[PDB]
Amino acid sequence: ATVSMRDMLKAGVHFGHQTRYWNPKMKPFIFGARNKVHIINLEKTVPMFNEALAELNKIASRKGKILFVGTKRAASEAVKDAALSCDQFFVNHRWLGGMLTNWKTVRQSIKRLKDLETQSQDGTFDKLTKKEALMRTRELEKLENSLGGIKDMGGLPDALFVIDADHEHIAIKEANNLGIPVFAIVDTNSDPDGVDFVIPGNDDAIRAVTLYLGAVAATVREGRS
RNA sequence: AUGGCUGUCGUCAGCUCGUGUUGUGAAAUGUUGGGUUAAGUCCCGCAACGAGCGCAACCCUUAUCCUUUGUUGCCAGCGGU
Structure with missing residues (x-):
């Protein structure tokens, strides 16, 4: 249920940014610098990865709701195959300022989404002209482009998963x-x-973000069972 | 001292609110930015997310055709003048 260090070496989890963009609040997790490129201290990460999954084991066991957040185009596709496979919620596109604290407004926009979602099945747009139908699908697709992954959220999620916090x-x-x-x-x-x-890990790698997603996929399915 | 009613900026495109966020606070953000339009009209980005009054549309007239009717209106297809 946990990942080995050998697989992470192939994943490129320790390939951080340069020594010009580094954050001084990461010193307890910085190993060294090769060609002026900081290496993530892998010794601290592995044990912290387990207790991270251990926390995921507790919340998922009590019918908890988690949220995977990642707005980078080099990670936007993996999160789609992640949440849908483990029966969870995700946000791959633009993170609206006020998705959590301003939930009383995003709740109605979801009703607005489900109003246009229900209108798309029966075919209510066939009696309106091409102007009214195209207008109702240009916003319906935009709400799908914004709230498409959290349509069946149901209140405030109990846990947050983030990719590249900064x-x-x-x-x-x-x-x-x-x-x-x-x-x-x-x-x-x-x-x-x-x-x-x-x-502590890398974000600009495809195989790096998937190794995290593969690990969090099984532990949450352990909670559902 | 007022109601109702009116002119003008100006038919200019702006004016604001609820929630969230930022700052001790007045307030800001939303309404900024790249393009675009007659226009905060529309799209994209974005700590903003939505909504309301306005703009637009729905109203009237004019322009083309068709259907319905033919008076006191009209006169082509046929006669008497």
Whole structure:
């Protein structure tokens, strides 16, 4: 149920950014620098990866709801195959400022989505002209482009999973406000203090983000069972 | 001292609210930015997300055809003048 260090070496989890963009709040997780490129200290990560999954074992056991957040085009596709396979919720596109704290408004937009979603099945657009139908599908697709992965959310999620916290610092501000356990994949240039469960790793690699997703996929399915 | 009614900026495209967020606060954000339009009209980005009054549309007239009717209106196809 846990990953080995050998597989992570092939995954490229320790290939951080340069020594010019590094964040000084990551010193306890910085190994060295080769060709002026910081290496993630893998010794601290592996044990912290398990307790991160251990926390995932507890929340998923009590019918908990988790949220995978990643707005990078080099990670936007993996999260789609992740949440849909493990029966969860995700946000691959633009993280709206106010998805959590301003839920009383995003709740109605979901009703607006489901209003146009229900209108798309029966075919109500066939009696309206081409102008009214195209207009109702240009927003319906935009809400699918925004709230498409959280249509059946049902209230505030109980856990937050983030990919590269510094690129998602809007989501962490909302997570620390409501008191939600946030599990983030922090990079050498990212923000560690905002997240209580930090997982020092890389974000600009395809195989790196999937190795995390493969691990979190099984542990949450262990909670559903 | 007022109601109702009116002129003008101006038919200019702006004016605001609920929630969230930012700053001790007045307030800001939304309404900024790249393009675009007659126009905060529309798309994309974006700590903003939505909505309301406005703009637009629905109203009237004019322009083309068809259907319905033919008076006191009209006169082509046929006669008497």
